Structures are given as C-alpha cells and as structure tokens.
Amino acid sequence: MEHVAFGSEDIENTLAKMDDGQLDGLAFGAIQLDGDGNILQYNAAEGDITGRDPKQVIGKNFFKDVAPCTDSPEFYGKFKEGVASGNLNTMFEYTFDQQMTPTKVKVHMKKALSGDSYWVFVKRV
Ligand SMILES: *C(=O)/C=C/c1ccc(O)cc1
C-alpha cells in the first residue's frame, strides 16, 4: 500500500488523492478540519490513540467538543492564526489529556491542498 511518511513535504497533496480506506492506512493520526475546526475526516490511527470512534467524531468540533485540551494558544491559537493567514505548517509536541489518558504526542498542522480544509497529524512520542 502507500505508506506516507509523517512530515512529507507534499503530505496534503497525497492525502487529497486518497481513495476509500487509504487514510486509515496511515501509521499516524490524521484529522481533517474546516475553518472552524469541525472534523471532516478522522482516521483509525488517531482513534487508536484517543479511544474515539472515528465515525462519531465527524461533524463535531475538534477544539470545543472532542479535544478541549487543545483549546489553548499553543494549539488552537496557532490553528486560528494559520487559518486567518492562509498559511499553516507547524510542528510542536503536545500533551493530550482532559478527555483521555495524558499522552505526549508530536503534532503537525498544515493547510490542505485545495479547498478550505486543514490537517492535524498526530503520533505518540
Ligand atoms: C485534549 O482534550 C485532547 C484530546 C484529543 C485529541 C485528539 C483526538 O483525536 C481526540 C481527543
């Protein structure tokens, strides 16, 4: 299959062309969000890290419903900024907690290929 690497320069492009099942093939977490942070895609990998049902979180807001612990300047702050600037490509470590067992992860946010969406890539560290 296609084993896209975390941090691939053109990761967004690749994910854009993916066909059914391909996203859940990534070894790391992948979440696609709209401008307000509403979840459009959520893969198996992320669900295995968070305990969340990928189907259930769809349509829910990432920062306000599912991942409230990311509602901070360090995460949500960077997101909104990148959204308002049309430029989003940053990497930082973060601790997921509050709605899950405290877990250290490496996060990569990047604007999507075309359209108005954004990607949040996650993997445990
Ligand atoms: C903070 O509350 C983190 C929670 C969280 C992050 C990412 C997910 O996919 C699900 C929950």
Task: Give the start-to-end residue ranges of the domains of the chain.
Answer: 1-125
Cβ burial, residue 42 (10 Å; 0-12/13-18/19+): buried
| Structure-block tokens of residue 60 | 């829910």
| Architecture, CATH, for domain 1-125 | 2-Layer Sandwich (3.30)
Q: Is 66 in the pocket of ligand 1 (CB under 6 A)?
A: yes
Using alpha carbons, select from 12, 24, 96 the residue that is nearest to residue 55: 24
CA dihedral 57, 49, 93, 1 (to 10 degrees): -90
Ligand 1 centre distance from Cα of residue 64 (Å): 10
Q: With beta carbons less than 8 A apart as the criterion, state whether 107 and 80 touch.
A: no
Please tell me the distance from the alpha carbon of residue 46 to that of residue 80, in angstroms, as a whole number: 22
Ligand 1 centre distance from Cα of residue 2 (Å): 26
Count of alpha carbons within 13 angstroms of residue 109, beta-carbon side: 24
Q: Is 67 in the pocket of ligand 1 (CB under 6 A)?
A: yes
Please tell me the distance from the alpha carbon of residue 119 to that of residue 46, in angstroms, as a whole number: 12
Using alpha carbons, select from 116, 38, 105 the residue that is nearest to residue 82: 116
Q: Is 46 in the pocket of ligand 1 (CB under 6 A)?
A: yes
